[PDB]
Amino acid sequence: SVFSERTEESSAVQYFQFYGYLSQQQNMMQDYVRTGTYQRAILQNHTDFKDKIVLDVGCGSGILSFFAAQAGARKIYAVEASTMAQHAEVLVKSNNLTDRIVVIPGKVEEVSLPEQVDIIISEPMGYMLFNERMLESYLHAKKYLKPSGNMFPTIGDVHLAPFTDEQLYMEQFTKANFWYQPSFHGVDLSALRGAAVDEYFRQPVVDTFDIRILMAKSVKYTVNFLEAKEGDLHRIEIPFKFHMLHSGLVHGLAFWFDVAFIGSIMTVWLSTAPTEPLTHWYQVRCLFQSPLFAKAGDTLSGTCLLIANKRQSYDISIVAQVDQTGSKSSNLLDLKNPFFRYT
Amino acid sequence: RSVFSERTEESSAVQYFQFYGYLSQQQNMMQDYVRTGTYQRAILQNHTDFKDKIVLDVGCGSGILSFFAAQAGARKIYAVEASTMAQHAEVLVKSNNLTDRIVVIPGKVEEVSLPEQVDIIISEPMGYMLFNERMLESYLHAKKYLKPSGNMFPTIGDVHLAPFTDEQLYMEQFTKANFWYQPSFHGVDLSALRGAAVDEYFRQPVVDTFDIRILMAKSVKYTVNFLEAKEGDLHRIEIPFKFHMLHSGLVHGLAFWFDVAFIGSIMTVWLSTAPTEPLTHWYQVRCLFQSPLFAKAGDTLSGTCLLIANKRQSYDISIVAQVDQTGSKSSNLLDLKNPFFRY
Amino acid sequence: SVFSERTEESSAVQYFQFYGYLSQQQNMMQDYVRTGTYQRAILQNHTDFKDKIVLDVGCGSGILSFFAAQAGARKIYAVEASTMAQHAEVLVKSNNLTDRIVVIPGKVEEVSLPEQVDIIISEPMGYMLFNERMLESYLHAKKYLKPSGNMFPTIGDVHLAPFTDEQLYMEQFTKANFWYQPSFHGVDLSALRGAAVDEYFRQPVVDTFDIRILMAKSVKYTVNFLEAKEGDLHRIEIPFKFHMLHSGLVHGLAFWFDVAFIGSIMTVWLSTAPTEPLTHWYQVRCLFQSPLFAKAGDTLSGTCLLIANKRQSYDISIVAQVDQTGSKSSNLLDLKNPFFR
Amino acid sequence: SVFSERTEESSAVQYFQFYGYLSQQQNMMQDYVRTGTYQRAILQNHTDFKDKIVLDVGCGSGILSFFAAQAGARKIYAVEASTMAQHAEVLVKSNNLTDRIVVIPGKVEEVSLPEQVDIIISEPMGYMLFNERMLESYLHAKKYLKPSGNMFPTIGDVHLAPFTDEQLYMEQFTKANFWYQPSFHGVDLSALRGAAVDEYFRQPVVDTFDIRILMAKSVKYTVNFLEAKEGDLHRIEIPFKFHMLHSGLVHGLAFWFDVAFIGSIMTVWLSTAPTEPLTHWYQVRCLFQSPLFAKAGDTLSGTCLLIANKRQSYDISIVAQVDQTGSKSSNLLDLKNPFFRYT
Numbered sequence A, D: 001s002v003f004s005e006r007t008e009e010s011s012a013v014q015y016f017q018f019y020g021y022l023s024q025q026q027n028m029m030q031d032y033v034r035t036g037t038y039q040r041a042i043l044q045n046h047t048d049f050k051d052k053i054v055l056d057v058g059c060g061s062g063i064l065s066f067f068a069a070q071a072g073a074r075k076i077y078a079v080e081a082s083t084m085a086q087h088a089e090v091l092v093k094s095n096n097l098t099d100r101i102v103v104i105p106g107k108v109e110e111v112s113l114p115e116q117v118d119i120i121i122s123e124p125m126g127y128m129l130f131n132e133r134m135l136e137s138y139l140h141a142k143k144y145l146k147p148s149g150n151m152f153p154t155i156g157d158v159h160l161a162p163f164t165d166e167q168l169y170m171e172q173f174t175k176a177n178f179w180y181q182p183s184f185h186g187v188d189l190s191a192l193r194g195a196a197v198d199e200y201f202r203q204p205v206v207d208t209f210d211i212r213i214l215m216a217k218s219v220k221y222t223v224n225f226l227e228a229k230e231g232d233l234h235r236i237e238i239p240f241k242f243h244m245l246h247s248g249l250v251h252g253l254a255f256w257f258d259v260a261f262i263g264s265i266m267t268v269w270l271s272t273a274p275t276e277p278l279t280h281w282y283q284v285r286c287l288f289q290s291p292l293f294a295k296a297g298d299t300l301s302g303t304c305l306l307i308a309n310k311r312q313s314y315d316i317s318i319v320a321q322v323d324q325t326g327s328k329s330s331n332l333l334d335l336k337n338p339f340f341r342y343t
Numbered sequence B: 001r002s003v004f005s006e007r008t009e010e011s012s013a014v015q016y017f018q019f020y021g022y023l024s025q026q027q028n029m030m031q032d033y034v035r036t037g038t039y040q041r042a043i044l045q046n047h048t049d050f051k052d053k054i055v056l057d058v059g060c061g062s063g064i065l066s067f068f069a070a071q072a073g074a075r076k077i078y079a080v081e082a083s084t085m086a087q088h089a090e091v092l093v094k095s096n097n098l099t100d101r102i103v104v105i106p107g108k109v110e111e112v113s114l115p116e117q118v119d120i121i122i123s124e125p126m127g128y129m130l131f132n133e134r135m136l137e138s139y140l141h142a143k144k145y146l147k148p149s150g151n152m153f154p155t156i157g158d159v160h161l162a163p164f165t166d167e168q169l170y171m172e173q174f175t176k177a178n179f180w181y182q183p184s185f186h187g188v189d190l191s192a193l194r195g196a197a198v199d200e201y202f203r204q205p206v207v208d209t210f211d212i213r214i215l216m217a218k219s220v221k222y223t224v225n226f227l228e229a230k231e232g233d234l235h236r237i238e239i240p241f242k243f244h245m246l247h248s249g250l251v252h253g254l255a256f257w258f259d260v261a262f263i264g265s266i267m268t269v270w271l272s273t274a275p276t277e278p279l280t281h282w283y284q285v286r287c288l289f290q291s292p293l294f295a296k297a298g299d300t301l302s303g304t305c306l307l308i309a310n311k312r313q314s315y316d317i318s319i320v321a322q323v324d325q326t327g328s329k330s331s332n333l334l335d336l337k338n339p340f341f342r343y
Numbered sequence C: 001s002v003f004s005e006r007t008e009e010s011s012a013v014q015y016f017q018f019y020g021y022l023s024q025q026q027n028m029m030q031d032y033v034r035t036g037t038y039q040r041a042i043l044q045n046h047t048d049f050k051d052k053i054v055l056d057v058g059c060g061s062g063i064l065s066f067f068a069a070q071a072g073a074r075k076i077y078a079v080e081a082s083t084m085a086q087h088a089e090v091l092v093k094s095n096n097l098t099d100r101i102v103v104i105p106g107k108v109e110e111v112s113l114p115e116q117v118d119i120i121i122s123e124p125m126g127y128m129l130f131n132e133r134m135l136e137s138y139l140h141a142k143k144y145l146k147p148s149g150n151m152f153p154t155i156g157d158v159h160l161a162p163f164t165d166e167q168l169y170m171e172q173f174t175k176a177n178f179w180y181q182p183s184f185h186g187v188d189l190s191a192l193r194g195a196a197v198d199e200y201f202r203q204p205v206v207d208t209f210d211i212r213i214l215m216a217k218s219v220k221y222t223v224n225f226l227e228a229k230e231g232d233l234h235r236i237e238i239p240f241k242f243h244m245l246h247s248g249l250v251h252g253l254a255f256w257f258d259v260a261f262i263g264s265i266m267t268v269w270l271s272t273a274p275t276e277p278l279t280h281w282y283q284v285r286c287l288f289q290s291p292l293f294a295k296a297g298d299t300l301s302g303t304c305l306l307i308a309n310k311r312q313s314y315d316i317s318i319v320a321q322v323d324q325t326g327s328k329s330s331n332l333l334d335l336k337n338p339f340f341r
């Protein structure tokens, strides 16, 4: 299948084992920004669901399938590949909805639906939006969407902006310099110091930050879920030209995302920006190997290239340059293994 | 057809060795001065056991233990490591000018081919509750390369268990599961999964430290002699116990820690993770009862701790506890692979 | 009679036995807030008693009748159905007020009075105000009240407000976990865990608390004793709509009450709010079996429904929901069986 | 019936409402002394239950019937008059003992049991042993007992001892002196002080105390449950002659009780003595209206006369004299309404 073609068995076993735990469902369900906003998007656009046929890609416990029911849906197909599907079935029965919700265990790339649907709902966003590569399953599910169909969420905006954080940058060499000692119990470790540094800079940093560290208006890369195909996400090239508002050293790029539910009654937004209440997605920062000096008025131009990998994530390639000086930096990051720095 | 692959799901093995390929994880283990300092003491203080001898280091990681044997005069050390950390070991061997003595042999100890039998095997195979990761079986499997006159460092391993009281910990876990009693979470009835939630939450071993005064009886000890034991002995580990209660109150579970002894020719050096000893990165492990048991001072608490090795490099743990006077009984299952790090 | 029709004899026996004890009269009288405020309301409004006919419903030891005598009342009929009525007569004689205070033994729904009165006085408030159902006896007595007569107290305000208090929550959940044991002395009790949680959470929690646990401004439900008819208190439906001020878990609703003595000279208030000095009424809190979550700005809507029962108390029904999310909590309470904490 | 002829209906309604609460069953079941001893006496005398027919009088939740089944009883009739019987039926079904335990809802004086039983078990002791007058229901059930049957408990002993507690005696007047003031908000209350004093003295005090306040070895009155008839408890005249071990003022009499399970294998004792762990029965003390001075070696003689009343309790008539001096005091207490003083 398409899923197994793009995924190492080892990665998938652990991925779906992780999501079979109720404590993880509870974690996602207890994010009120997430759960609240989805419920509002669906209920405030009841006309997009009333008496319609719905598909819920990766329903977990089925919470989004119940909001669709509250909105007046006629039939909801809830697809879930982990063992959480067993618990979703229990909740459909205990809530007297077996007539309107059908739980289909399995991967959305492999199950079969009995009819086409009017709208697909899902929550496929990972870290930096794209982590987990579940947006490809969301788009893959469009093979069941009528030409009339809508997508909830409808679009996705990735935002990237240069930041300054001297203490975050310095923390990397503080940790790596453990290896730069010539007699750790009589053993000279210094030969591995460069490797340790490299390892730390290859981790995206997951936490939040004061918006004042940002040095320029963000650049926006949009994914239109109504028009995009799975292949469009195998290689995501994000060019950027930042016009610096403050002078200082740029230590990397900060990432966040928004999604919009574009309904017939209104559009509802779900934002993980550092200016909005915190969510379980936090924000993501990718450091440059060497900081770049820029002054207010200069331009910072380059590209952020995301290359999907068979571990359900992306290899990140960032190259940036101050146009007025030619000073250049880059970095390679493995989004699968981020550093969770939040306290 | 290797012994390792026959007892290990591929998915678990891949992630296991990816996890230990990280230098940041080597740092965490090496920076535990109790671990690294005691291992060096046991080796250097028993240098006669290593002078001009052949050594095998099972799971050398970065190679620290192999360096200790080189300091003690070992004639030749074979350092086996299956993760990509093996290549980092080689770098340290070259930069420390020990290429004539330390031979890194990459691969699994169940699959490599050593050129000769060895006088002594050294390893640090202890996980949480001693037995997690199932590396003791690889340690014992390596005895096929050990001369009949040889030794094991560590030589024996003691598992200690004792009953404890801690209502806050018990209520802390039951609090998390009350989420799934909700009759109307955003209008959805979750109560049907309250049973499934409590089972999942009370399947998690609690890894952290605690005050020794929560222990309500003298610990029971279960000893594994690594010189005598056979690989197959660790597929099923049955630990009966009978505690003489020193205090009255509620028994909320059993606490677990372990000691290992390096029984050398010059002296025996002990490495302990007991709560009366300085904290290590192993901490201590506590298994909770879903329903606490009451006992008075003078009563006896008896039962069995049974560990069944699973294909995911861990153990499924069943604990049955009974106060003999009243017949009050508590049966509990725990997934040692997925613990709650509470510290 | 009206009283016997709405009261199991079994309840009435114990009820009036309880109030026949001097020790229980000492308890109420030593509440200086209660006793001092009643005296202040009566004496400050002495013109509403000067040379007037008075009726004191459920006088107990007769303390309120003496206050009316101090204010110049010409004649005070003091009705008391327990044996305490004879103790009141002793005090009337020892204080040399036989010319002004006339103890009438019996239930106010069954005694005859020589004449009509100008003002009724009484202390009929119980826990959560309505417990004991004496407000109906207080209102029933209005058959003896002249037109345009006054009522002391004149009105009663009930205040509701959501609160957060996880300790009280898992405290009542702890007691209930005893019935989850699958082997108590070898016996599986778990089949009764549902009945245990229900029973334990039907008990109102009577105690005081810090005002900072309240999550919204209180909602007020007023009872006008001058206008209300006793039948109005058989089924009390109190709608509420709170505007949440803080985000967090709502573990239930807190109840207190104030009464106002609206006299000719002055309006005197007697409050049992948590912002005010504690009284023997304390405050009341009704726990949800499952807490509700709400963010600051959300609205919590529902109704508190009180159905009076034949045991001189009420069956309480509280249904509350977070309007934005549909999170709903339905809970029942037996006001007759409180938990003094 | 016999129950209704000796009980006022108002008293009966509140009595069985009280015991319909699970919270009250837990209160008695959580007394380890009560529940642990009953279990011990039944199991350690298993020969008195194996393949026998049993009657549990006032089973409550049925805990004692389960103990009887643990001992191997063939058939157990469990009689309970309150609505707790329906809960007992649930536990019988949930413990898979519907073939051994049959719950009979109703009063033991009124229900119809088909056959004679081999042994009757019950926990009918109240404050001072006799409060609640349930011992008469226990003896009344002997109409179903074979002539060779047994009773668990077999016998009951009530112990009387003189005590000194100046603080307790004075506490009465401090409370009653609230009324001895000429202007309480302008009201002379002093006319009711005598009535307040009398009221406090008619109340037995339920709480514990330090054994050191006892001034003589206790006097013991025994009820042999195999021999007694329920009519023997309508009027219980207990003559006492105490030999004073200490000199001082005697303020009243203290009461506790023991019961013994005289089985075929052994005799097990359940004590509520002040020298033993505290139970939910505490102890009881009745004050003299005037204290009596007695020297060590003197004798304090008199009678404690308990007269049953229609409120499932007793009126207590105590009369005491110092033989050597001729000083007398007495009191007449209402056991149905005690003063709970324990803190």
Ligand SMILES: NC(=[NH2+])NCC[C@H]1O[C@@H](n2cnc3c(N)ncnc32)[C@H](O)[C@@H]1O
Binding pocket: A003, A016, A019, A057, A058, A059, A060, A079, A080, A081, A082, A084, A106, A107, A108, A109, A123, A124, A125, A126, A127, A132, A134, A137
């Ligand atoms: N939104 C996230 N970042 N994570 C939630 C993913 C949820 O969708 C489920 N899921 C992920 N991929 C798939 C798929 N291809 N088919 C079905 N369910 C899936 C997964 O088991 C979990 O319940």
Ligand SMILES: NC(=[NH2+])NCC[C@H]1O[C@@H](n2cnc3c(N)ncnc32)[C@H](O)[C@@H]1O
Binding pocket: B004, B017, B020, B058, B059, B060, B061, B080, B081, B082, B083, B085, B107, B108, B109, B110, B124, B125, B126, B127, B133, B135, B138
């Ligand atoms: N001491 C621990 N609890 N864990 C450390 C395990 C270390 O041994 C390595 N290791 C584990 N099992 C094996 C094996 N069968 N063969 C070789 N190396 C192994 C692993 O890669 C890591 O470096």
Ligand SMILES: NC(=[NH2+])NCC[C@H]1O[C@@H](n2cnc3c(N)ncnc32)[C@H](O)[C@@H]1O
Binding pocket: C003, C016, C019, C057, C058, C059, C060, C061, C079, C080, C081, C082, C084, C106, C107, C108, C109, C123, C124, C125, C126, C127, C132, C134, C137
């Ligand atoms: N305020 C309270 N919570 N209780 C006060 C009740 C007092 O009034 C008396 N009382 C209660 N109901 C009645 C009644 N219907 N008629 C007369 N006295 C009554 C009761 O005996 C006690 O003295």
Ligand SMILES: NC(=[NH2+])NCC[C@H]1O[C@@H](n2cnc3c(N)ncnc32)[C@H](O)[C@@H]1O
Binding pocket: D003, D016, D019, D057, D058, D059, D060, D079, D080, D081, D082, D084, D106, D107, D108, D109, D123, D124, D125, D126, D127, D132, D134, D137
């Ligand atoms: N041991 C005590 N002091 N009290 C226990 C009283 C228990 O016996 C029950 N009980 C009391 N009298 C009777 C009776 N005549 N018939 C049946 N059950 C009774 C009562 O319902 C409660 O469960």
